[PDB]
Amino acid sequence: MQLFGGRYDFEDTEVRRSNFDNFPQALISVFQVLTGEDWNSVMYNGIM
């Protein structure tokens, strides 16, 4: 929530549900990187 909190301000209509905006939505976005499922796309949003 500090690193990528509110930084997903992309100017396209692509949807990104696994983001770190609030606590209930950062917990879900961390649990998914922990179960190693589609975690490589949560990294490309964090890098872009």
Partner: protein, 973 residues
Amino acid sequence: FPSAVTIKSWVDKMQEDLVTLAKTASGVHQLVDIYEKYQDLYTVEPNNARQLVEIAARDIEKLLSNRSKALVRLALEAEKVQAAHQWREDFASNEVVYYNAKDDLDPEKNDSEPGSQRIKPVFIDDANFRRQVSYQHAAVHIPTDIYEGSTIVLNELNWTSALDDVFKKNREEDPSLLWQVFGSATGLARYYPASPWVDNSRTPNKIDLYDVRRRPWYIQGAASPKDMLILVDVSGSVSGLTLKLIRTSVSEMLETLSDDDFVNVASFNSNAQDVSCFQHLVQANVRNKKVLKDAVNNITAKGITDYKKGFSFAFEQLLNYNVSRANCNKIIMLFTDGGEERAQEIFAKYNKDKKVRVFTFSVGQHNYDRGPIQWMACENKGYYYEIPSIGAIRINTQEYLDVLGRPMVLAGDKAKQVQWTNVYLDALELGLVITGTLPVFNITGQFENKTNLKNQLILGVMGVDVSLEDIKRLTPRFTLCPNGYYFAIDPNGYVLLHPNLQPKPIGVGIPTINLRKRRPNVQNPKSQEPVTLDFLDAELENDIKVEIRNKMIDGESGEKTFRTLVKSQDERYIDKGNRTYTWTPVNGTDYSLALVLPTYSFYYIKAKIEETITQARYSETLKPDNFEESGYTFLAPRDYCSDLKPSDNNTEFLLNFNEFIDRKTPNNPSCNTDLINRVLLDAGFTNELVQNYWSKQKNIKGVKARFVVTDGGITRVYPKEAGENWQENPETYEDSFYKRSLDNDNYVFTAPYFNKSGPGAYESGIMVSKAVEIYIQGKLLKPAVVGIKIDVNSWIENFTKDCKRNSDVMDCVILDDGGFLLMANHDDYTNQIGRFFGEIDPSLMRHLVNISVYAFNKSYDYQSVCEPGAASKQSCITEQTQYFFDNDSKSFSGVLDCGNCSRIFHVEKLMNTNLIFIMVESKGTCPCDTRLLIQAEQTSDGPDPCDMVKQPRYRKGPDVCFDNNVLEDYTDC
């Protein structure tokens, strides 16, 4: 360097030779004497320039009145028929049979969707429509992304089915009606006569985005003029996709504003500032809207939010009253995402009395609070909209005209007045039209006061088109010279009728395209703007025309004779001519009609040929096979009779015209007998001239073609071998040289074009013209123009016989008023005959402009076509320059010091023509050149509107204003 006296004698002999050749070979005097020797085949009638304006104004008022009477009928029937509608919700067994336009015409589809049943029409072909129409039923247009079969749409298609008989009876009561349309608040548009839509949905590759609820006529007849103040939110939280949707939404919202509405775009993030260079409500015309859009597309998002600052700024912008406003609807549009401050303080401090509405748009997919925004919305009589994607923008940024229309409904029968739109281009390709609208009210249970919940909104708007070819027929312009004309005016400046209003859209700025960001199959949208061309932007602008304009905008009659610069047909010259503007108001409506007559045009010629033998004898002369005895004959494509139509292939037209005038007796039952009598009398006169004079000296030394262009379309070019070298228009009222040589009282040289593909330098020759001018009863007349094409070679050799061909001691050129090269002395100049002189000797030309021999005027053309820049064609503004003689003194001697050197020059104007002989030290002497002085349409973007709004043109506004009725509901948000 030769002295002044020898040069004066040179130009004296040169001018004398030129003038005597033109006078003795064209035949001015002989045509004058034969125009004066008859005096019995015709009569001289006066143009009472006041009676004409009154008659034309009454004809226009009567036409618009007949179009009004066909609107209140439609609206009455629509209100009555919808009042008695029962709202069924099961349409399976009872099909709704109708003709959905933009459906396929192959007769083996048989769609018959659930609840609906189509029709296969017959589609005869028509005139007054450039397409195929069916007078049996009305067509329906349903926007692409609106399902046809929704119970809301199938109900409109039910109770609108009873409009078709009133459509039919209106049409058969007045067979010259164009489209009648009912455009309803559910997207539908039912128009008559039926005709397939121009863009089917996906049967072609392209999409149609036409929503009857965004059209100018609908948005006009659905509310009253506004004072909008779009208050964008550029806080940090709107960054991302919300900001993009806010930009697109503000643009699509501006596209719903007309020229009577005033608008400004603020922007707040812990500080409220304007978004552009304006700082107060501006008039929302095409240029101001372009400025606002280009400034909104640069918005960036960063900071904290503060609604109190933004609303203080908005409410303080809506209280200026130092500027011109619409003074009717004060609304604030807040484009935001979500917040927590509702700020009751500011709404109590500024609109405790609720004069300013608030519409709040919450944009994007976010997780913020919207309670405060809905509260602001439906606390201040406003409304609340949600815009989550690009697809909902077009539908949410147009639906506030349901809120703004409540007072117009609670006003009732007082609020039903027909009002006419700006000039715009028809959506079914009819050209330029104006549409008259009248709203339709929903009255269910009106004698017992039952619901009044759906009965606050209108149903739709009823409109009916009036083409501008319908108005240009009530102002017939063929008893005036090529120079006089009618023109009308809005109570806004904008022009409704003019000789300089073209069917193209009004251009803004400089066109820029990025070809490298457009997929080949994406179907870009095109345009929606009206053709709003101000009156001062169609002509040249004195400060006496500003006076006439501001005097006829407020419905005054009068007359004014003065002297003005007039720009020739081809935008290359300028003439100081006298004019007489006589104007009057059109009583029924808010237009004003003026007539421009040049003195020498207060009398015209009326044919009186009644001895049918003379008629037949004259009509014999315009037959192709005897051209070798009378010269190539062109005939202007005017509508003499109902049957034949202008052909654009003048041989086709001359053949049809001859076979017509002999195919029907001279009785003339259905023919415009005055036009035809004049044309035949004219042909007789011209043929007598050609036979008695041009036939005797079959060939002269310098002449190449001797022609006569007159009133009645008759154009005669003597050697048919020169008839193939006539690039002029056959309609003599569009011949640039004709209108030019009517103004001047002497000979006029028309410098040919340069580097344009065609026979233009040596095969054709240089054109010289003079206007025949006769006195019948002490009354001036200028009925014809006689001319000559001078051979370039004979002129060169008479020019040389100290100037020698390809000399290098000096240069000796001949230019005209306009600075175009005619006869040079260097064989490389002479190669480029017809080019602007400032393009082949820029230093001398700038100096000439400086020493005040050549004055110049600059203007803008707002409907031009250009190749887009880098940042098929687009529409563009082109600046046009035009040079002319200002000082009437002849000789000008001097010397230009072009830096460390100086070349001496002497210029002398050949009197009795428009020619100027220049003799200068050679250009090889001084190796100086600043830069070319181009006279051509240079694509520009000015004037800067950031400065025109500080001191705008005069304008009057509509005085009916329906806002703030106190029995409203406003329990909606």
